[PDB]
Coordinates of N, CA and C in Angstrom, one line a residue:
Chain A
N539 N -61.6 -11.5 -4.7 CA -61.9 -11.0 -6.1 C -63.2 -11.6 -6.6
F540 N -64.3 -11.6 -5.9 CA -65.5 -12.2 -6.2 C -66.0 -11.9 -7.5
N541 N -66.0 -12.7 -8.5 CA -66.6 -12.7 -9.8 C -66.1 -11.3 -10.4
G542 N -64.8 -11.0 -10.2 CA -64.0 -9.9 -10.8 C -64.2 -8.6 -9.9
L543 N -65.0 -8.6 -8.9 CA -65.0 -7.5 -8.0 C -63.9 -7.6 -6.9
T544 N -62.8 -6.9 -7.3 CA -61.7 -7.0 -6.2 C -61.9 -6.1 -5.1
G545 N -61.4 -6.4 -4.0 CA -61.7 -5.7 -2.7 C -60.9 -6.4 -1.6
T546 N -61.1 -5.7 -0.4 CA -60.5 -6.3 0.9 C -61.6 -6.2 1.9
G547 N -61.5 -7.1 2.9 CA -62.4 -7.2 4.1 C -62.5 -8.4 4.6
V548 N -63.4 -8.6 5.6 CA -63.6 -9.9 6.3 C -65.1 -10.5 5.9
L549 N -65.0 -11.7 5.5 CA -66.2 -12.3 5.1 C -66.8 -13.2 6.2
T550 N -68.1 -13.0 6.5 CA -68.7 -13.7 7.6 C -70.1 -14.2 7.1
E551 N -70.8 -14.9 7.9 CA -72.1 -15.4 7.7 C -73.0 -14.2 7.6
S552 N -74.1 -14.2 6.5 CA -74.9 -13.3 6.3 C -76.4 -13.7 6.7
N553 N -76.9 -12.8 7.4 CA -78.3 -12.9 7.7 C -79.4 -12.2 6.9
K554 N -78.9 -11.8 5.7 CA -79.7 -11.1 4.7 C -80.8 -12.1 4.0
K555 N -81.7 -11.5 3.3 CA -82.7 -12.3 2.8 C -82.7 -12.2 1.2
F556 N -81.5 -12.5 0.7 CA -81.3 -12.5 -0.8 C -82.3 -13.5 -1.5
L557 N -83.0 -12.8 -2.5 CA -83.8 -13.6 -3.4 C -82.9 -14.4 -4.3
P558 N -83.2 -15.5 -5.0 CA -82.3 -16.4 -5.7 C -81.7 -15.8 -6.9
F559 N -81.8 -14.6 -7.3 CA -81.4 -14.0 -8.5 C -80.6 -12.7 -8.3
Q560 N -79.6 -12.7 -7.4 CA -78.7 -11.5 -7.2 C -77.3 -12.0 -7.3
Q561 N -76.3 -11.1 -7.3 CA -74.9 -11.1 -7.3 C -74.3 -10.3 -6.4
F562 N -74.9 -9.1 -6.1 CA -74.3 -8.1 -5.4 C -75.3 -7.6 -4.2
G563 N -74.7 -7.0 -3.2 CA -75.6 -6.5 -2.2 C -75.7 -5.0 -2.3
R564 N -74.6 -4.2 -2.1 CA -74.6 -2.8 -2.3 C -75.7 -2.3 -1.4
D565 N -75.7 -2.5 -0.1 CA -76.8 -2.2 0.8 C -77.0 -0.6 0.9
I566 N -76.0 0.2 1.2 CA -76.0 1.6 1.4 C -74.8 2.3 0.6
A567 N -75.1 3.6 0.3 CA -74.1 4.4 -0.4 C -73.8 3.6 -1.7
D568 N -72.6 3.5 -2.0 CA -72.1 2.8 -3.2 C -71.0 1.8 -2.8
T569 N -71.3 1.1 -1.6 CA -70.3 0.1 -1.0 C -71.0 -1.2 -1.1
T570 N -70.4 -2.2 -1.8 CA -70.9 -3.5 -1.8 C -70.8 -4.1 -0.4
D571 N -71.9 -4.8 0.0 CA -72.1 -5.3 1.4 C -72.0 -6.9 1.4
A572 N -73.0 -7.5 0.7 CA -73.0 -8.9 0.5 C -72.9 -9.5 -0.8
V573 N -72.3 -10.5 -1.0 CA -72.0 -11.2 -2.3 C -72.3 -12.5 -2.4
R574 N -73.1 -12.9 -3.4 CA -73.5 -14.4 -3.5 C -72.3 -15.1 -4.0
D575 N -72.0 -16.2 -3.4 CA -70.9 -17.1 -3.6 C -71.1 -17.7 -5.1
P576 N -70.2 -17.4 -6.0 CA -70.6 -17.9 -7.4 C -70.6 -19.4 -7.4
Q577 N -69.8 -20.1 -6.7 CA -69.8 -21.5 -6.8 C -70.4 -22.3 -5.6
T578 N -71.0 -21.5 -4.8 CA -71.8 -22.1 -3.8 C -73.1 -21.6 -3.5
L579 N -73.6 -20.4 -4.1 CA -74.9 -19.8 -4.0 C -75.2 -19.5 -2.5
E580 N -74.2 -18.9 -1.9 CA -74.4 -18.5 -0.5 C -73.9 -17.1 -0.3
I581 N -74.7 -16.4 0.4 CA -74.3 -14.9 0.6 C -73.3 -14.7 1.7
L582 N -72.3 -13.9 1.3 CA -71.2 -13.6 2.2 C -71.3 -12.1 2.5
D583 N -71.4 -11.7 3.8 CA -71.2 -10.4 4.2 C -69.8 -9.9 4.0
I584 N -69.6 -8.6 3.6 CA -68.3 -8.0 3.4 C -68.2 -6.8 4.4
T585 N -67.2 -6.9 5.4 CA -67.0 -5.8 6.2 C -65.4 -5.4 6.1
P586 N -65.2 -4.1 5.8 CA -63.9 -3.7 5.4 C -62.9 -3.8 6.7
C587 N -61.6 -3.8 6.3 CA -60.5 -4.1 7.2 C -60.8 -3.1 8.5
Chain B
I847 N -75.3 4.6 7.5 CA -75.6 5.1 8.9 C -74.2 5.4 9.5
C848 N -74.2 5.4 10.9 CA -73.1 5.9 11.5 C -71.9 4.8 11.4
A849 N -72.3 3.6 11.4 CA -71.3 2.5 11.1 C -70.8 2.4 9.8
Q850 N -71.6 2.9 8.9 CA -71.3 3.0 7.5 C -70.2 4.0 7.0
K851 N -69.9 4.9 7.9 CA -68.8 6.0 7.6 C -67.5 5.3 7.9
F852 N -67.2 4.2 7.1 CA -65.9 3.4 7.2 C -64.9 4.3 6.5
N853 N -65.0 4.5 5.3 CA -64.0 5.1 4.5 C -63.6 6.5 5.0
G854 N -62.5 6.6 5.7 CA -61.9 7.7 6.1 C -62.6 8.5 7.2
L855 N -63.8 8.8 7.1 CA -64.8 9.6 7.8 C -64.7 9.1 9.4
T856 N -64.4 9.9 10.4 CA -64.6 9.3 11.7 C -65.1 10.4 12.5
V857 N -65.6 10.1 13.8 CA -66.1 11.1 14.8 C -65.5 10.9 16.0
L858 N -64.4 11.8 16.4 CA -63.8 11.7 17.8 C -64.8 12.1 18.7
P859 N -64.8 11.3 20.0 CA -65.6 11.6 21.0 C -65.3 13.1 21.6
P860 N -66.2 13.8 22.2 CA -65.8 15.0 22.9 C -64.9 14.7 24.1
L861 N -64.0 15.7 24.5 CA -63.2 15.5 25.6 C -64.0 15.5 26.9
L862 N -65.1 16.2 27.0 CA -65.9 16.1 28.2 C -67.0 15.3 27.9
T863 N -67.2 14.1 28.5 CA -68.4 13.4 28.2 C -69.7 13.9 28.9
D864 N -70.8 13.8 28.3 CA -72.1 14.3 28.8 C -72.6 13.5 30.0
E865 N -71.7 13.2 30.9 CA -72.0 12.8 32.3 C -71.2 13.4 33.3
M866 N -70.0 14.0 32.9 CA -69.2 14.7 33.8 C -69.3 16.3 33.4
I867 N -69.9 16.5 32.2 CA -70.4 18.0 32.0 C -71.6 18.2 32.8
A868 N -72.5 17.2 33.2 CA -73.7 17.4 34.1 C -73.1 17.7 35.5
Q869 N -72.0 17.3 35.8 CA -71.4 17.9 37.2 C -71.0 19.3 37.1
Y870 N -70.5 19.8 36.0 CA -70.3 21.2 35.8 C -71.5 22.0 36.1
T871 N -72.7 21.7 35.3 CA -73.9 22.5 35.6 C -74.4 22.2 37.0
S872 N -74.2 21.1 37.6 CA -74.6 20.8 38.9 C -73.8 21.6 39.9
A873 N -72.4 21.9 39.6 CA -71.7 22.9 40.5 C -72.2 24.3 40.3
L874 N -72.5 24.6 38.9 CA -73.0 26.0 38.8 C -74.5 26.2 39.4
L875 N -75.2 25.2 39.4 CA -76.6 25.2 40.2 C -76.3 25.3 41.6
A876 N -75.4 24.5 42.2 CA -75.1 24.5 43.6 C -74.6 25.8 44.1
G877 N -73.7 26.4 43.3 CA -73.2 27.7 43.8 C -74.3 28.9 43.6
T878 N -75.1 28.8 42.6 CA -76.0 29.9 42.4 C -77.3 29.8 43.3
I879 N -77.5 28.7 43.9 CA -78.8 28.5 44.8 C -78.4 28.6 46.3
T880 N -77.0 28.4 46.6 CA -76.6 28.4 48.0 C -75.7 29.6 48.2

């Protein structure tokens, strides 16, 4: 339930290149991919079940 | 991309792989030249 964005999946380490002012990835289509950790400032990849 | 077709959409592989299909065409060539 990252910052109000509920969903399901597996969270792994992200090799993305997030600049320091994002909250959402949404890499392709309209599916969120990577999320910045609100209380850690780390990017977590999201892969569905 | 192909892996991004998560939600619902899938692609079943063909029953005849395109390496045993090449045996069918090989048989057709073998018959038609001998």
